[PDB]
């Protein structure tokens, strides 16, 4: 359905990209290349073509004038020349003459990048609210643009949907395969399909479970919500955190959709919110009063493994305890290596908890799909029709 950089004429023509660049700093200095080593491909393709490359990226937040200094393109622009073996001409500008200038003297293969988006938000918010004037102004810069930036596919931005109007506009590579997978588990699943829910909050995946209801087949859930939907059930939880604003929900969850719903058996509770805290495993009908419940037990997780066998495909999304504390993280790395484990089955990770997990658990290649978009990737499996996907032409 939707064109790719692949199905374009680039050859001579000044191709617009908005690349996802947003990397982890410190002092100014970059923590982590992976976003960059990502966008890649897609730009060394249309270097190949001939195309001339002008990029976009925000980084980080700008929300008043101190914040600029530390927040310039100038160090990626320079980490990306080392990657290309070739100079990015950086123009420390967001528009104007010498910005202008520059774009035209690029030959085919030339790589230039403008300075981050999020400058223009200081005078009005015209990049993350879309200007009508500042997507037009840039679109005006090229003949035809490339989003390959999924992470900000679910907000309406200059740099997104703004210049996505004046201009064709194609999937990057990478775009391209979070449309294939994300996309497909909503649009055209390849059946069964199997949903693994954790992290904290009930509230946080609600929307979520409303939507995966009607595809998936199992709806496995952990993590500190699960406390919820266990005491939806009648049981007690201790001190385990509690929305009870959220138990009618549960409890009509359960009625409307019951062994749909697979809940932990056991959980590892501990007195005290600490990785040093005596912890005791415990069948779910007997969470002592005064304790927390802070990860699946042993059971759950073969219980979870199990539940996935014969899905072809999975999506998680959460951690199934607090995986921040060494003592407590099992539950997260046994369910995790289940799904890596898991033959003939697409597996999917949404949400940047469980992404960040995988991948520092040595699992970032086992998985067909990990995400680059936290909040974005949870939004469209929500059913929602993200802005920055609808803009993108249609092949």
């Known amino acids: 359905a939707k064109k790719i950089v692949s199905d374009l004429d680039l050859k001579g023509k000044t191709v617009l990209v908005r690349a996802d660049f947003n990397v982890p700093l410190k002092d100014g200095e970059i923590t982590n290349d992976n976003r960059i080593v990502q966008a890649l491909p897609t730009i060394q393709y249309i270097i190949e073509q001939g195309g001339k490359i002008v990029l976009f ?217 600490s990785n040093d805290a005596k912890i005791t495993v415990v069948p779910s009908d007997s969470i002592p009063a005064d304790q927390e419940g802070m990860d699946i037990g042993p059971n759950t997780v073969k219980l979870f493994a199990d539940e996935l066998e014969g899905a072809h495909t999975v999506v998680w999304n959460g951690p199934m305890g607090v995986f921040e504390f060494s003592n407590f993280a099992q539950g997260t790395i046994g369910v995790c290596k289940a799904i890596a484990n898991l033959k003939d089955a697409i597996t999917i990770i949404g949400g940047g908890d469980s992404a960040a997990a995988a991948i520092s658990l040595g699992f970032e290649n086992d998985f067909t799909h990990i995400s680059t978009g936290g909040g974005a990737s949870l939004e469209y499996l929500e059913g929602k029709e993200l802005p920055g996907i609808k803009a993108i032409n249609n092949k």
């Open 57 to 273: 990226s925000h980084l980080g937040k700008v929300k008043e004038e101190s914040d600029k200094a530390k927040l310039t393109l100038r160090p990626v622009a320079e980490d990306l020349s080392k990657k290309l073996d070739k100079e990015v001409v950086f123009v420390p500008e967001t528009r104007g003459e010498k910005l202008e200038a520059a774009i035209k003297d690029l030959k085919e293969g030339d790589v230039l990048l403008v300075e981050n988006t999020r400058y223009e938000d200081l005078d009005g918010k015209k990049e993350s609210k879309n200007d009508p004037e500042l997507g037009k102004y840039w679109a005006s810069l090229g003949d035809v643009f490339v989003n390959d930036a999924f992470g900000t596919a679910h907000r309406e931005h200059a740099s997104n949907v703004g210049i996505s109007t004046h201009l064709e506009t194609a999937a990057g590579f990478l775009m391209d395969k979070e449309i294939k997978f994300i996309g497909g588990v909503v649009n055209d699943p390849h059946k069964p399909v199997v949903a693994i829910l954790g992290g904290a909050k009930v509230s946080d995946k609600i929307n979520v479970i409303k939507n995966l209801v009607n595809i998936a087949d199992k709806i496995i859930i952990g993590g500190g919500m699960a406390y919820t939907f266990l005491k939806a059930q009648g049981k007690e939880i201790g001190i385990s955190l509690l929305e009870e604003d959220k138990i009618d929900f549960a409890k009509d969850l359960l009625e409307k959709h019951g062994d749909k719903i697979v809940l932990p058996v056991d959980t590892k509770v501990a007195k005290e919110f």
